[PDB]
């Protein structure tokens, strides 16, 4: 009813019934929302007229924190809700509201809560299902109803609806079951196949009634006949009703099947075969497919009961068995099914043992189809054939590895060319990076060639003149125009109506592109998650739209393009069409500031290439552009060069540089470069011995000097110092503290500006002051040296801490500031406990954080701890009265979930104690969000803004949960000292249920958790991983008490060891428990006897069901395709994370799998090290790979390109090397997490856990470090990774563990 | 060539370009490329180049982080037994030698001999074989 | 001062080395033509076609700076781009078609194509050809 007014009184008038940006932002979010679609267009043009009136504040509010804004999230929903239109024209106003909103980073998008394409499953057996028969009612309505209004059509139909209205009542359960409205009034109204197709059978429907009067003879059911009977008078008076009738008319045929019939269908399966009427009768074989999937859902009901149905599924089974998968995935290709012919080219492969090599020509047609960045190449290095050299250019094209290469494909072409088109991609590989020179004689050559490809390559030669923005160039776009456009064609067409000055008949083109946009939109429609494989796309189109905006000011929000680029998310495709945008921005513009601007956005897109690496290229696109010099963008141009090789040589010739740009002024940025330039001079200075390291020290204080503002230049000194104060210890340790703290007061003022690197870095900083101050109450029990003198340097660097306090904010600190004060707890306290009063400062920042750190305390005597947390909530009861109340309604609150972790099918616990459902029900304990790992996680700190970025935004921001209580009997799971899991009602009302087991401890899974998705935050910014486009599942326990942790269940959870009895269940193979145990291996196996012995229990034991249980995953061949991906998401990289950590050995019941996608789980992996591994059994594979398991992932192949992808995150993660060694430091540091598994220690450690910390540097190298003597290549670590899954007697070492035959 | 003879120096290309995974690829291919499971050859120049591509693996191995003593004792026997003559296979067993003596010793010079007077009647048989080597085998 | 004298000197000595000594010593980076004979001692053919594309990219009145960037297709020794560079060459050329032709003909002798040495033989260039003309003796 709410709806946009042009009267501000009419809306007020309206609002007191009813009854500050982001609130009109939430009345637009119900506004894009739309009862009328009418409506929503007025809507559509409102909001974006409402992004425009937000302006730069718009901007403002979309950046804030690194993470994403909430009310962006918001936006994102909107986004969602956005350019998704039936009218092409409301589509179209939707898509230019998302423009002028930009293109989020998909990792920077953080909606994956939205039910999105998961929903209960559409099929039904049907005409018993009420669906069922309101689909025929469905079918009647519209193009029925329809041919109902024509009298020839009619006839038929009104006998159809007459036996509809026979078949079903129109009342009034049925009437309530039926949409009725205009449907109940046409109610009262109411009231094997050659000839298909191919000559009468024609298009489709014709063929239907052909099917139609042999399917009513094939049921057996003469109820399914006369449901056929009047489904086939429909059938001739609807195409689509005969289409939908076609499905129905194959159950039926599924359930009584002719032999001349069954004839019939392997005469459908030749007509398909045989296959605008091709592509409806592809999409006629699809539907026989859909069919086909209807029935294996009636032969599921079959399976699931317990004779003539097990003999109809036998049937069904027979038609399949008719129906060759290969030959479908043929038609499939054909179909251009994509993952979904993929799926029917797996099941052919599963149906019949096929070569590799066949198999593989097929995959690497498949590849094409499937565009996986891998694509081809991933499948050849799967294929143990070498490459037909055709079949090798189209690898290297699935690589794209761009540059070198190019011209060998053309070299291929050259050999022979029996494609102009294949002449075009070698002209394509000719343009190279944007390179003028080469297209202007591959367009000469092109014009001596007759092709439509020729043509094509004008269009290109038309881009490239939109590169050149000369007019000359626009002459030879006029050559191009009046010939097909490619869509980038179209865009070069755009460049030449801004020379045409056409302004709103340019428009009018802009609107035609935006069309060819919309086509890729309607691609783009698809299963959630489908919107980051288009972003790209939607990218292009949001350039489409900052190119209208250009369009605006030709004709004459904030729209900086750099603005819009940074919001968009960057990946080295895409920040090369991002630069051509700029570029093409800056050639429109006529300003010679303009031109310096395109040397600048060079520059930009040299930045972009030196993330894209092709350094050579990038040297290149600076020759491209040039001109508008800046000595330290010729320095940086030169640094990315020095990155890739002579980094050295490079920062010799960036001194020159520096020497032309300074003589005096600071010139603004350029200042603050010199600086940087002085911190690769640093970089450099540690790469060469003759580089001094105190001469180093001194360039490090001049860059400080440059900017004292900028935190990187001080956060990037103290990373030095502190490389300089261990080297100056030599490991001395003893005097330390006082370089420390000169080294921490350049992190602090590093930290003061604020980073998102700084955080990071201050962390790490932190827990070095904390190690210096337990260091200091070491020497002062010691008596070493002086304890005075120690401590003397102690009370400055407290000192130095109580300043940097000051400057610190306690959501900057966020996440990092708890995690540091389990750790920061300590005997000695004295001015750490006052560093610890100032963590608690932070602890009443943010009240759930506070929580958290509170059921730690509860779990430990913690006599010292809870002296400091009296302390804290004296300074909370300072800091406000409800302050100190809310610690004591948390304390309750902490005590009714002590209740629920002593746990004394469903048990009422709530209902066998008042108290505690009393509790539930009392507000007065304040509202708590339930426990989250995202919830639990601080909302980063913008890296727009370096101070108060964490500021403005929540230090953790979620929506917040307000506890409704809990029901009076929870389910609980049963298990030796079981969890038991109850769920709050949620202030949203979801309720999950969390159990908290004995023997298990929440805090210690709490820092696991807190080191977990610190990868996935850093994916996020990853383009790679942004291109997997995985999240990392991270578990959240919540359980104060050490003894029992609690975790709400997972939803859809699956123990990799139950779905394996599952898969034993539905083989109905059956392994005794008893007969494993008859299985005997010596404690002494002989190693070869107990592999031998294993391996061939292991194949009887476990055929593999994985495929099995991927395709009961997904319905959909290509939902299937996409769990598979899930699957491929799963273990991969995070399994080697924790191969690398070497911390893991989760048990396979332990593990769990998302039912609808998935998704691999590590449960109560308590060994860190292998210390679990060294304890009885060693398995050798870092990541537990079940053969069945890896079968299932592999679908044709079991290798994984996308886990060798996962593999290269791994080296990302190795990459933020720096990251990963604060967190590894932090798992040791924290007195609740045990180095070496509070009442001992009111206010673990483990020697090994230290060598461990050396281990995980060690895994960073890469470096075998078991080998003899010996050199460290992350991809071979992979293989190696891959190879110790895969023997056999790595299995044989390890004992019970996974524990699986396959 | 069904051999891979170019397309196995386009693996000592990829040694070049010095990724070990991927030159431990290219070594596979080799091998397959010859056979999937090639005998060494008849001819006596293809069987040289199957031990080339055998003392290439062993090169591999000393990049790889992870690799067996004893299978890269294997591989040079390998290399040997498809040239007793050719220097480039005795040459490759000499430079596995001398790295396997200083594991022998494991920082002893008592605890090194045995395996050192195998490894020098290598050397002697590598400079026979050929003197390209034969300088370096001398000292 | 020196340095233009000596840009000139290094053309005389055809000596990468005393080219190399030149960059280092110059106080302000060759650009454009200055960077082409910078790019020549440096002898890496991708940072020449880059070279080649920026000088043309900032005017393309020789033939010569063509040339250069068809030896950077000589380098990249692929038959199908040395044609594609070839055609383009001759439309460019309108002043001097067949200047780079020779170029092409080394290039036919590469495709080994006597039909290819066909076109290249119909043209005429009063010039050594360098081993080109030694082809065309090739050719028959
Ligand atoms: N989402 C979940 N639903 C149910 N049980 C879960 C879930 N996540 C973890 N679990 C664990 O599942 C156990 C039940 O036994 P299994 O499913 O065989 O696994 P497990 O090896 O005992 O798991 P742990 O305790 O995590 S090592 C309980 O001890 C739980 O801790």
Not at chain 1, 382 to 394: F, G, N, W
Request: charged share 25%; with cysteine; aromatic share 10%.
């Amino acid at each position: 009813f709410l709806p946009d007014h042009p009267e501000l009184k009419k809306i007020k008038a309206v609002l007191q019934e009813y009854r500050d940006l982001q609130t009109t932002l939430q009345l637009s979010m119900k506004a894009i929302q739309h009862e009328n679609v009418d409506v929503r267009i007025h809507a559509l043009t409102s909001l974006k007229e409402t992004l425009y009136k937000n302006q730069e504040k718009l901007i403002k509010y979309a950046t804030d924190s690194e993470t994403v804004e909430p009310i962006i999230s918001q936006l994102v929903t909107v986004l969602l809700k956005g350019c998704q239109d039936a009218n092409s024209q409301a589509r179209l106003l939707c898509g230019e509201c998302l423009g002028e909103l930009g293109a989020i980073d998909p990792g920077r998008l953080d909606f994956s809560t939205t039910e999105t394409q998961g929903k209960d499953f559409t099929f039904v057996t049907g005409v018993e299902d009420s669906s069922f028969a309101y689909g025929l009612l469905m079918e009647l309505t519209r193009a029925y109803l329809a041919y109902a209004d024509n009298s020839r059509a009619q006839d038929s139909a009104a006998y159809a609806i007459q036996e509809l209205l026979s078949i079903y009542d129109c009342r009034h359960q049925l009437w309530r079951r039926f949409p009725e409205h205009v449907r109940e009034i046409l109610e009262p109204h109411l009231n094997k196949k050659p000839i298909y197709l191919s000559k009468l059978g024609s298009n489709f429907a014709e063929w239907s009634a052909s099917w139609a009067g042999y399917l009513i003879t094939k049921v057996r059911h003469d109820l399914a006949s006369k449901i056929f009977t009047c489904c086939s008078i429909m059938m001739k008076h609807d195409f689509k009703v005969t289409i939908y009738l076609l499905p129905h008319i194959l159950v039926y045929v599924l359930l009584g099947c002719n032999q001349e019939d069954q004839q019939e269908v392997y005469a459908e399966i030749m007509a398909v075969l045989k296959h605008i009427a091709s592509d409806l009768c592809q999409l006629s074989t699809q539907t026989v497919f859909s069919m086909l999937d209807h029935l294996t859902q009636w032969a599921r009901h079959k399976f699931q009961a317990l004779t003539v149905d097990y003999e109809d599924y036998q049937s069904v089974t027979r038609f399949l068995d008719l129906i060759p998968q290969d030959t479908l995935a043929v038609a499939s290709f054909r179909s251009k099914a994509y993952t979904r012919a993929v799926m029917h080219f797996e099941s052919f492969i599963t149906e019949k043992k096929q070569n590799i090599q066949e198999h593989l020509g097929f995959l690497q047609k498949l590849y094409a189809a499937m565009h996986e960045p891998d694509g081809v190449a991933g499948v050849s290095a799967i294929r143990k054939a070498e490459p037909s050299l055709k079949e090798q250019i189209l690898e290297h094209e699935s690589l794209g590895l761009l540059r070198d290469a190019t011209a060998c494909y053309d070299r291929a072409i050259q050999l022979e060319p029996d494609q102009i088109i294949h002449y075009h991609g070698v002209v394509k590989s000719m343009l190279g990076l944007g390179q003028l020179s080469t297209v202007i004689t591959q367009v000469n050559g092109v014009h001596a060639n007759r092709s439509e490809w020729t043509d094509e390559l004008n269009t290109y030669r038309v881009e490239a003149a939109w590169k050149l923005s000369q007019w000359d160039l626009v002459e030879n776009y006029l050559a191009a125009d009046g010939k097909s456009t490619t869509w980038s064609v179209r865009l070069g067409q755009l460049l030449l109506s801004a020379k045409k000055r056409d302004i709103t008949a340019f428009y009018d083109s802009l609107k035609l592109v935006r069309a060819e946009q919309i086509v890729p939109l309607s691609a783009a429609s698809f299963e959630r998650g489908s919107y980051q494989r288009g972003y790209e796309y939607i990218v292009r189109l949001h350039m489409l739209c900052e190119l209208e905006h250009s369009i605006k000011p030709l004709f004459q929000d904030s729209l900086n393009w750099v603005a819009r680029l940074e919001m968009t998310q960057n990946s080295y495709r895409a920040k090369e069409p991002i630069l051509a945008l700029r570029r093409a921005l800056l050639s429109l513009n006529k300003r010679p500031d303009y031109n310096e601007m395109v040397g600048e956005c060079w520059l930009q897109s040299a930045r972009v290439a030196r993330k894209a690496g092709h350094h050579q290229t990038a040297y290149n696109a600076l020759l491209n552009a040039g001109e508008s010099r800046l000595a330290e963008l010729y320095v940086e141009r030169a640094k990315w060069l020095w990155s890739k090789g002579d980094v050295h040589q490079a920062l010799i010739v960036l001194q020159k540089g520096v020497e032309l740009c300074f003589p005096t002024p600071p010139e603004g940025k350029n200042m603050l470069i010199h600086g940087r330039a002085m911190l690769l001079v640093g970089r450099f200075m540690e790469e060469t011995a003759n580089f001094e390291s105190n001469a180093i020290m001194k360039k490090y204080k001049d860059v400080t000097a440059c900017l004292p503002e900028w935190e990187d230049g001080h956060f990037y000194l103290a990373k030095y110092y502190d490389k300089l104060m261990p080297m100056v210890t030599d490991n001395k340790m003893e005097k330390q503290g006082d370089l420390i703290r000169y080294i921490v007061l350049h992190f602090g003022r590093s930290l003061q500006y604020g980073n998102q690197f700084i955080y990071q870095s201050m962390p790490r900083m932190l827990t070095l002051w904390l190690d210096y101050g337990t260091k200091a109450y070491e020497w002062e029990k010691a008596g070493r040296s002086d304890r005075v003198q120690m401590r003397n340097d102690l009370g400055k660097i407290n000192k130095v801490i109580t300043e940097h306090t000051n400057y610190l904010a306690p959501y900057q600190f966020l996440t990092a500031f708890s995690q540091l004060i389990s750790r920061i707890c300590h005997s000695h306290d004295e001015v750490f406990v006052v560093l610890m009063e100032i963590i608690a400062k932070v602890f009443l920042a943010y009240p759930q954080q506070a929580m958290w750190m509170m059921t730690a305390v509860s779990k430990s005597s913690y006599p010292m701890r809870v002296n400091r947390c009296k302390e804290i909530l004296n300074k909370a009861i300072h800091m406000k009265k409800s302050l100190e109340k809310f610690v004591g309604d948390a304390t309750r609150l902490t005590d009714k979930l002590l209740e629920l972790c002593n746990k004394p099918s469903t048990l009422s616990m709530s209902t066998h104690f008042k108290m505690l459902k009393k509790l539930v029900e009392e507000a007065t304990f304040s509202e708590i969000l339930i426990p989250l790992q995202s919830v639990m996680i601080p909302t980063l700190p913008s890296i727009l803004g370096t101070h108060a970025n964490h500021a403005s935004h929540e230090p953790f921001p979620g929506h917040w949960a307000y506890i409704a209580g809990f029901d009076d009997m929870v389910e609980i799971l049963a298990s030796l000292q079981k969890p038991k899991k109850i769920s709050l009602k949620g202030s949203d009302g979801k309720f999950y249920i969390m159990m908290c087991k004995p023997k298990d401890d929440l805090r210690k899974d709490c820092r696991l958790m807190e080191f977990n998705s610190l990868i996935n935050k850093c994916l996020r910014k990853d383009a790679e991983s942004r291109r997997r486009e995985l999240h990392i599942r991270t578990y959240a326990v919540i359980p104060l008490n050490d003894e029992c942790g609690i975790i709400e269940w997972v939803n859809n959870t699956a123990g990799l060891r139950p779905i394996l009895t599952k898969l034993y269940k539905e083989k109905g193979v059956y392994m005794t428990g008893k007969e494993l145990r008859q299985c005997m291996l010596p404690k002494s196996a002989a190693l070869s006897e107990k592999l031998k012995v294993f391996r061939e229990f292991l194949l009887p034991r476990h055929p593999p069901i994985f495929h099995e249980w991927f395709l009961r995953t997904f319905p959909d061949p290509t939902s299937w395709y996409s769990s598979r991906s899930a699957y491929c998401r799963s273990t991969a990289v995070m399994s080697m994370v924790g191969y690398i950590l070497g911390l893991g050995d989760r048990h396979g019941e332990n593990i769990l799998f998302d039912s609808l996608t998935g998704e691999c789980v590590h449960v109560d992996f308590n060994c860190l090290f292998n210390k679990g591994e060294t304890f009885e059994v060693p398995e050798i594979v870092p990541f537990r790979l079940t053969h069945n398991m890896v079968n299932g992932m592999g679908p044709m192949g079991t290798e994984g390109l996308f886990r060798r992808a996962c593999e290269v995150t791994m080296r990302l993660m190795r990459d933020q090397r720096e990251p990963l060694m604060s967190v590894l430091k932090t798992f040791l540091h924290d007195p609740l997490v045990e180095w070496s598994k509070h009442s001992k220690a009111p206010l673990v450690v483990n020697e090994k856990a230290k060598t461990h910390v050396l281990d995980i540097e060690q895994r960073l190298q890469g470096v075998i470090k078991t080998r003899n003597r010996v050199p460290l290549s992350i991809e071979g670590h992979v293989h190696y990774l891959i190879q110790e899954a895969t023997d056999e007697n790595l299995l044989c070492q390890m004992y019970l563990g996974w524990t699986p035959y396959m | 060539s069904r051999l891979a003879e170019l397309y196995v120096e386009r693996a000592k290309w990829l040694w070049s370009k010095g990724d070990v995974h991927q030159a431990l690829i290219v070594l596979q291919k080799g091998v397959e490329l010859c056979f999937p499971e090639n005998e060494t050859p008849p001819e006596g120049k293809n069987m040289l180049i199957h031990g080339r591509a055998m003392l290439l693996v062993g090169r591999f191995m000393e990049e790889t982080a992870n690799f067996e003593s004893n299978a890269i004792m294997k591989k040079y026997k390998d290399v040997t037994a498809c040239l007793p003559e050719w220097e480039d296979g005795h040459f490759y067993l000499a430079k596995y030698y001398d790295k396997l003596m200083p594991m022998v010793t494991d920082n002893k010079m008592e605890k090194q001999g045995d395996l050192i007077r195998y490894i020098v009647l290598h050397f002697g048989r590598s400079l026979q074989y050929g003197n390209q080597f034969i300088y370096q085998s001398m000292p």
